């Protein structure tokens, strides 16, 4: 209740507590932030938050330099505090104001400590969902990206690891949820496609097969979100095509554009090869038109891939439909 | 240095320098001449640019022009004289005859050469030929009239076509109701714009003015009276757009020359009158090889026949045009036929273009409306998506609110956060 | 002996029927299988014509024995350069041979298909294969079936080895002698539409030397053709290095053709390729590798335009 | 008929026809005026084509009205205006404003005449009040003159300088291009062999103006020029030479200047500073402290006669390089302008690059034709071999006593041999 105790907490935090002593403090702090009025929080406020994060930074740093780690408890308790601290408009706003706060949340996403990754992924997902500021998703992603460059790993690794067969249903649902939270709020179709295609290259598609089997309402909800969002992206891509057909109906003007697009790119030679092969299409009055139609079906099914992802460029077999 | 090439090559005709005074301490002094010499060089170089009796009558100029002509022609001087008397077209040609007329000695020179027909083998080859021609009575008239006959069929076909074209054009125009339509439409639209003007209530305008419709532009010079009339036809009277097809000969008529035509015919009638007068002065043929008067009377008949067909067609053509002028109200005498069909040909071409330009304008206008539509649909689609995101957490009102985060998380758990 | 050759000509022209016609043709056969070439010249064209007048009468109308016998005489008659040459000079000789290919009478068809096959092989005249083909066409037009139907029926399961082998060999005799690669591919592809591919899979199971031989000939030729078409591409790469020039050529080819709309739709879809630095070249590559499997189709045949699920393998065959 | 539209429309100024003497039994007499009428037609049409104080005592009538308008748009106190001019307050002055004042200022006599009526000031019109104020500023016209030259000085310095830089650079790029020098030596060589035995033979150099003409010397069959030949030599045996066009980067800019205009333009900046120098030496001593002329135009006349000197440097230098180029490549600098010389060189450079390019296309085309000829022989040999193999089965011509011709053929088919 006291308003002085918020100042005391700030001081204990900076006092150099370790192990079960630091933990017993965090646990008290978690409880204070969860029971007092928002005004108490404001008193703790930024300097308090910063104190939480300095510790979190020390802990993530001693766990990179370690082998067996009882640490989980303190790191995770700090995550529980952050939730409490962000359980109001002030704390959220204060958090986003930090320089390293979102990054630290990301680094708490370690699939080996599932319940901590779960809690940290929820908060990240909440941030993505926000109306203000603009493009919270891209900021969360920027941080995931920075963690990835430091550990030197694919930035979506920890999420795919969390979906693998061994892990709890709770962790899967949390990983999908954060994927959904990164993709769904983005306004630009190309962006949704980029990200989704990226997750697929990392094995997202096979994992999805497994998760669709699980009899779990929370899991179904996230799958339906992901699927529906993919279908809507396909529907948009198809609309770009209708637009192109309407606007670009002149062989020359389209050719010049395709050219301008691939010039000075690894794609140029491929295009030249394609044209050359069309010259090789058997010169027969019945068969030529059918060659071209077959080719056009093949091109269509590649460029307009279904489900708003890129084709799998490593998969070496295709089934063109007719 | 000094070279010595086997093959003389083409050269750059520059203006040279010589070391003596011409050089000093310039660029040219410090030039090593063998610095670029190969024998292969001069090889490739020499490859590309290498540079691989007695006269008793005729003057000296005529005997020489014949000495030439004759050596080339090569034909028994007797055979020649024969093909000229018979008028044997199996051997005669237009060129052949013209060379003869140009190469031929003067009539006096031939006079003095057929009085020397005693010493024939004694003469130069250029006078042996001249003796042989000194025989044929009425030589030059013979040749001219022959030439004319050789040219007649061809000079008819440089006349008939044009009279045909122009007649066709004149008919096509008078019979095209789709063209008449366009005219009526134009008077209508024009009479409205000229309301209260001195030009108000017109019963017609001069048909020459058509190429000027285009000159009448809207406020923003984006549209003309011609495009307007053409769009009107396109939208509400498609039948009119077919008038350019009902005037297949107008283009050919615009290319004619009524003057050259009038002359061309007038010359043909003189050329017949000339032949006619050479047949009516001609010595009765001595020998049976002289099938002239025979063949030319046959000819002067057929010729006057065809000529009179032509003069009909042409007097008719002039009448059509004069009546065109009565019908569309203009002074035929002020405007040559071609000038007139050119103005019409130009108009037709302008109209075809206006139609085309209209179609491209309408396309460009669709493009711009469809963009407006999709861009506006977009500002809505998103504004609406943004509004749904603000229904989750209003980041601006109640501060002493807790459970903000627990709300976001329940929305996420349940699906509600996603739309 | 030479007296009875003039006789045959008058026996064939007398209107013999059934077993009388038959015993005359059986003798005619042995006379032809046994007397020196000079005896055949003495039977000659006028006698060939009468076999053929009868052949045409029979076809127009258990005739089997009579027709078939005429076919054995033909084989005998044309077992020397004189007979063959004379055969070729006939207006409807090759056509009637064609009409003898009734999968109903397996042994008649076998014999006619060998003669026709032999005809395709000749160096002179030029392009015998095409004249055989022309006849196959004409028959086909008057029965209202596909010109290669009879050939395919004979390849079908219940039919004897000999007939199978004979149909494949005639097929090889129409294709292999052809100069132009375009022609061979045309014909092979026409057979494939009629169901050839599936029939060959069944004949591959049969242990039979004669059959293996015709199959090896047929396959090797596909291979040589495929290889030749790969060469066409190597040339193209050498001569058409220029976007504009290639573009214009394709354009002239497809213009005013059922192919124009597709080519436009191809170019329009390419504009849809995701505008990403990494993915864009991969799209184009992938498109390119599928276009290659389609256009340079294997075994010198067109792709199966009728399959509703076309399969494309862009993994390497050999390493 | 008769209309009465609300808005005047643009019209066709055609020449109208009236029913009277104008019509007779023509096309127009049989027209139905209402045949095309709509109220919508006239609507579309109306849319597109619619059509939308005090007495003078000195100043002449014109000047008064001009000043009346100018002082109306200007809108500043006649006392303020006086101040800016005296102080030379550069925070207010503009090229624009000082060029208006010079334009509108009454004659000096009209100011002297108003300066003698400074008594009736409130009674005078605006135009003359201004006149009385300015009739005060001593040596007004020189003062506005000098003030402008200063406002413009910077800008006119930089229409002179960059040109003097271009010519200087180009002059250096040339003198120093060994790749260009090479091309000259190679040209001299070739030229000399070509001219071997002519009056031009053994030349120690040619005049560099001549380069643009090398191309004028064609081969036997005019398919090849001396310039393409020289350019092939370089491509094949001296690539470096092909880089001389890049070593001459300023040549194009130099080709576009004007020696005459720099000379004039610099000499005028000389007289302009000598006109403002003396306008500071005859200048009356300042009566009041706002007159910062004799002060600031002495700080200018120093800095300006300073930059002029630096340009005069570069310019005397530049000219020297061109006179030196003339000594080095042996040409009269005085008979040929700078820009003319560099235009000739610039042109040649282009000719060269282009000859190079055309050579390549030529070689590509020679390749295509050769490979095509190889393939045509490969095929003719392919089919002959394949035909010689077909004839090893049978020669339909040799001996006819053979039976089993057709048994042979079937054993071939049967075994594979036939294939
Ligand atoms: O850093 C994110 C990112 O990198 C880019 C460009 O390098 O692509 C790469 O990074 C992804 C993982 O983020 C890997 O899959 C790569 O293979 C790759 O080169 C770019 O796409 C971008 O957004
Ligand atoms: O219009 C989009 C679209 O059409 C479908 C079914 O007709 O495929 C076809 O249309 C395309 C391009 O969209 C061509 O590639 C075709 O060959 C074709 O019949 C369907 O796939 C669909 O999404
Ligand atoms: O008569 C041979 C022939 O007909 C053409 C053109 O009509 O092809 C048709 O006939 C073939 C078989 O002969 C069938 O496979 C068809 O599908 C077909 O339309 C033709 O190309 C040609 O040479
Ligand atoms: O040259 C024909 C050809 O090469 C193969 C195997 O290397 O494919 C390569 O070349 C094709 C185009 O011809 C490209 O699509 C490649 O991606 C490729 O590696 C083979 O398929 C074949 O027929």
Author numbering:
A (entry chain A): 131 to 452
B (entry chain F): 754 to 805, 830 to 1196
C (entry chain B): 132 to 192, 200 to 457
D (entry chain E): 754 to 805, 829 to 1195
From the reporting publication:
Formins are conserved actin regulators, which function in formation of stress fibers, actin cables, the cytokinetic ring and filopodia. Diaphanous-related formins (DRFs) including mDia, Daam and FRL are effectors of Rho family GTPases, which function in processes such as cell migration, cytokinesis, cell polarity signaling, phagocytosis, and cancer metastasis. In isolation, DRFs are autoinhibited through binding of a C-terminal diaphanous autoinhibitory domain (DAD), which immediately follows the FH2 domain in sequence, and an N-terminal diaphanous inhibitory domain (DID).
Here we report the crystal structure of an autoinhibitory complex of mDia1 formed in trans between the DID-DD and FH2-DAD fragments of the protein. Only the construct completely lacking the CC region (residues 131–457, DID-DD) yielded crystals in complex with FH2-DAD. These diffracted to 2.75 Å under synchrotron illumination. In the crystal, an asymmetric unit contains four chains each of DID-DD and FH2-DAD, consistent with the heavier mass observed in our ultracentrifugation and MALS data above. These are organized into two dimers of DID-DD (blue and grey in Fig. 2A), each of which is bound to a DAD element (red), and four bridge elements (dark/light green and dark/light tan). The linkers between bridge elements are not observed in the electron density, nor are the connections from bridge to DAD. In the autoinhibited structure presented here, the long axes of the DID elements are roughly collinear, with a relative angle of 167°, and the DD dimer is slightly displaced perpendicularly to this axis. The mDia1 lasso wraps around the post region as seen in Bni1p and Daam1, confirming a universal structure of the FH2 domain. At Leu1169 it connects to a loop that joins to the α-helical region of the DAD (Val1181-Gly1192), which is bound to the concave surface of the DID and ends at Phe1195. The weak electron density for the αT-DAD loop suggests that this element is flexible. The interaction between the DID and DAD is essentially the same as observed in the previously described DID•DAD and DID-DD•DAD complexes with backbone r.m.s.d. of 0.6 Å and 1.5 Å, respectively, between DAD on superimposed DIDs.
